[PDB]
Design an enzyme around this catalytic site. Structure first.
Site, mmCIF file in Angstrom:
data_model
loop_
_atom_site.group_PDB
_atom_site.id
_atom_site.type_symbol
_atom_site.label_atom_id
_atom_site.label_comp_id
_atom_site.label_asym_id
_atom_site.label_seq_id
_atom_site.Cartn_x
_atom_site.Cartn_y
_atom_site.Cartn_z
ATOM 1 N N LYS A 20 45.586 -52.373 56.590
ATOM 2 C CA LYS A 20 46.901 -51.749 56.550
ATOM 3 C C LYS A 20 46.740 -50.241 56.407
ATOM 4 O O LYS A 20 46.039 -49.770 55.506
ATOM 5 C CB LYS A 20 47.736 -52.310 55.399
ATOM 6 C CG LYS A 20 49.152 -51.780 55.348
ATOM 7 C CD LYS A 20 49.940 -52.437 54.231
ATOM 8 C CE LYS A 20 51.357 -51.900 54.168
ATOM 9 N NZ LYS A 20 52.144 -52.555 53.092
ATOM 10 N N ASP A 56 63.678 -59.103 47.307
ATOM 11 C CA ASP A 56 63.973 -59.900 48.488
ATOM 12 C C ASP A 56 62.921 -61.007 48.564
ATOM 13 O O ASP A 56 62.074 -61.064 49.452
ATOM 14 C CB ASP A 56 63.984 -59.051 49.762
ATOM 15 C CG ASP A 56 65.196 -58.151 49.850
ATOM 16 O OD1 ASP A 56 66.291 -58.656 50.173
ATOM 17 O OD2 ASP A 56 65.049 -56.936 49.604
#
Lengths: 96, 190, 114, 179
Positions: B35, B115
């Site tokens: 990443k 979330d």
RNA sequence: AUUAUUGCUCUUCAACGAGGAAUUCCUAGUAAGCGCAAGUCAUCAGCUUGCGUUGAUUACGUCCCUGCCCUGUAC
RNA sequence: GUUCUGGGCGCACGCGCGCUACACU
RNA sequence: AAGGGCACCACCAGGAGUGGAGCCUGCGGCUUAAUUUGAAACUCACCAGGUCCACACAAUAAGAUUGACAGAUUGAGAGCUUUCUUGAUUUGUGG
């Protein structure tokens, strides 16, 4: 006496760029098989006018390739690549 | 902006797979998985790496972090598939039950997800893959966000799976409720 | 036995092309009604000679005519069908009736994202 | 109507030429009937094919439309240069020199068209008994192509130098000193 | 016209329960709904531009965010 | 250089402009 | 060599939406002989496979050479079998 004095036999292959695009050029006669273009793909290219470049991929069956360079090329330039082989001294004998 | 290339040099030297492209993103790009964050402030990456390292130092089902420098992070690649396309798992009652108990652990560690929903759960049989904009248990809206997560996971099991000590039918209580490590990483709310 | 739209195999081979077109679906009927070009005639000329001289099979005749309809006159022949690159060798079995030759030579490789 | 043969003129270069056009030169009225073929619709390959089939009244064809198609092809071409088959047809012309000069020469008397035409007229030999007449007509910068026609190496040619006595005009005058 | 341009008829009946993090356009005959004509063009648009029909809610402000334009001391 | 016949302008996946819907207005 | 102004490619109050499903389509990547940089031929620029095409010395020709009926050969073909016709450009070595 210095055994570290390595000698390398340099070789230059050369081919003709013949079709030109805003992002790539393609070159003839340097190789004749797609397998060869793939095997030597990683070695950098240079022009004798001094630009560097690299192989992208094989094109077709006759061993054409297409390549990218530092800038504009033209048919008056030539494309080359350099390769090197180890050499060793031969022995010697007295004379009389 | 040549740093966008040259920044590799520390990782490139300290790190051995070449990796492959997986996806462009708005804040970060992803490529045995690498990443890359997105001129200066992103060296954010340290905050993420230490946060993930802490949670993986705990027993939580999260990917193991390996290494991090110069806005580059390397992580365990996930074997599963995204939950949002799940339709037929062989033991939906235990899966429901134990997703609930996962929330309880975060709350006991003082943390709440923003979330906890099917876009970031991948398939215990599952793993939780990121923690955007997490908040402390002490935040003024902690219970409001807490109950959203519970109802979000309940809605999914109703709509697709038709499902509706442990939680749910076969356990003493149907689902947890808010009234029943933040200071180390004060993301919000002390 | 084989049969085509109720016509038995043994009455085929005897059937002419201009008879056969009456059985075929609309695409074939239009193609002949719109007048097929001369080009098959040279192919047909050669194909007959190979069959007649054959000792047993007639061995391949090869062509670029991918857009050609299979017609009973050519049943049993062996043909090499060009592929844009290579030739593929095929024998005209009776089930092939009314197909295009191009359906038997694949202009592209599979792809597997290895 | 001849358009029943003339309609094929847009593609006759793909192969064997129609006999209904190839027989047309056998008719003595065809010098007027050939305009019934719509020759301006003919593809250049047929113009080249017609040039080989057109082989002094043939100058009435060569100059009657062939030189007009040549000037139209170079002037109408987006690169300003004649097409290969028109150029190959032009170099395939000149089989009679008096037709090349009497038809294509004097009536041709911009500079970019003169240079292209000269690049063909130097491509083949010519009879010296005709070249002497060519120098007399050239002795009459659009005439500067005479500095190329004299480059091939008569008492009237010496007199033409006496009547004729840019860098190409000085250079051509210098070449006229080479004896 | 096969690896299938388009049209017509019968049969087959998939996902999808108003959609997380993020994010686009807009102050009146305007947004949005709906359709037509031209363009390219043998045939072939779910595209582009123009036109008409029906026709709202919410401001009439600010420098909070983003970005632009004016006039030396902890940086 | 000229020209002819056949093929090509496929999809594990990432990003973006669209079309059609989830019904009783 | 910190203040002031302005804008729904900025916000506020809102509207219609995108992002979630199927399909069309642009780019990247993958694959391949090539997948070139309002595409069935051409376009076309990509792939496989076929024909056809300065001068100076030495040789050579009044037959150097040119052209045309009927028919031919390949995966792609046309005045090569046949035999008339025309009249000054051909083969080597050094731009």
């Amino acid at each position: 006496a210095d055994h570290s004095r390595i000698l390398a036999k340099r070789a230059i292959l050369t081919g003709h760029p013949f079709r030109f695009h805003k992002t790539v050029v393609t070159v003839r006669y340097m190789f004749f098989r797609p397998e060869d273009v793939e095997w030597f793909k990683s070695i950098p290219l240079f022009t004798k006018s001094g630009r560097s470049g690299f192989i992208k991929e094989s094109l077709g069956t006759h061993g054409y390739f297409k390549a990218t360079f530092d800038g504009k090329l033209s048919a008056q330039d030539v494309v080359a690549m350099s390769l090197y082989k180890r050499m060793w001294p031969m022995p010697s004998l007295p004379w009389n | 902006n040549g740093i966008d290339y040259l920044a590799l040099k520390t990782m490139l030297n300290r790190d051995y797979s070449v990796g492959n492209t997986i996806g462009v993103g708005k804040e970060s790009d992803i490529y045995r998985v690498m990443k890359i964050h997105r001129m200066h402030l992103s060296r954010a990456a340290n905050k993420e790496y230490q946060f993930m390292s802490m949670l993986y130092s705990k027993g939580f089902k999260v990917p193991e972090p390996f290494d991090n420098s110069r806005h580059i992070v390397v992580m365990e690649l996930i074997e599963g598939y995204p939950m949002r396309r799940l339709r037929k798992h062989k033991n939906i009652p235990k899966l429901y039950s134990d997703l609930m108990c996962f929330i309880v652990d975060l709350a006991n560690s003082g943390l709440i997800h923003c979330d906890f929903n099917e876009f970031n759960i991948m398939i215990c049989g599952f793993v939780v893959i990121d923690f955007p904009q997490c908040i402390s248990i002490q935040h003024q809206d902690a219970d409001y966000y807490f109950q959203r997560d519970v109802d979000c996971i309940r809605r999914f099991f109703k709509k697709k799976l038709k499902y509706e000590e442990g939680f749910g039918d076969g356990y003493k209580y149907a689902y947890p409720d808010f009234k029943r490590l933040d200071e180390l990483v004060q993301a919000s709310g002390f | 036995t084989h049969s085509y739209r109720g016509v038995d195999l043994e009455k085929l081979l005897e059937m002419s092309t201009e008879d056969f077109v009456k059985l075929a679906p609309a695409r074939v009927r239009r193609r002949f009604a719109r007048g097929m070009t001369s080009k098959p005639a040279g192919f047909m000329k050669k194909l007959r000679a190979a069959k007649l001289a054959a000792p047993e099979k007639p061995a391949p005749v090869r062509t670029h005519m991918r857009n050609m309809i299979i017609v009973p006159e050519m049943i049993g022949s062996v043909v090499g069908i060009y592929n844009g690159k290579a030739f593929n060798q095929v024998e005209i079995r009776p089930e092939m009736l009314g197909h295009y030759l191009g359906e038997f030579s694949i202009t592209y490789t599979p792809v597997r994202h290895g | 109507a001849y358009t029943t043969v003339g309609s094929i003129l847009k593609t006759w270069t793909h192969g064997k030429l129609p006999k209904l056009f190839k027989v047309i030169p056998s008719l003595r009225n065809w010098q007027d009937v050939i305009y019934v073929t719509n020759p301006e619709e003919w593809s250049p390959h047929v113009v080249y094919e017609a040039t080989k089939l057109f082989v002094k009244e043939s100058q009435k064809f060569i100059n009657l439309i062939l030189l007009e198609r040549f000037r139209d092809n170079i002037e109408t071409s987006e690169d300003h240069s004649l097409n290969y088959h028109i150029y190959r047809a032009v170099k395939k012309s000149l089989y009679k020199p008096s037709a090349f000069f009497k038809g294509f020469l004097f009536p041709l008397v911009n500079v970019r068209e003169a240079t292209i035409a000269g690049s063909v007229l130097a491509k083949v030999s010519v009879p010296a008994l005709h070249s002497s007449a060519a120098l007399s007509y050239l002795l009459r910068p659009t005439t500067v192509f005479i500095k190329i026609l004299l480059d091939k190496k008569p008492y009237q040619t010496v007199d033409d130098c006496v009547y004729y006595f840019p860098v190409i005009w000085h250079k051509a005058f210098l070449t006229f000193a080479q004896r």
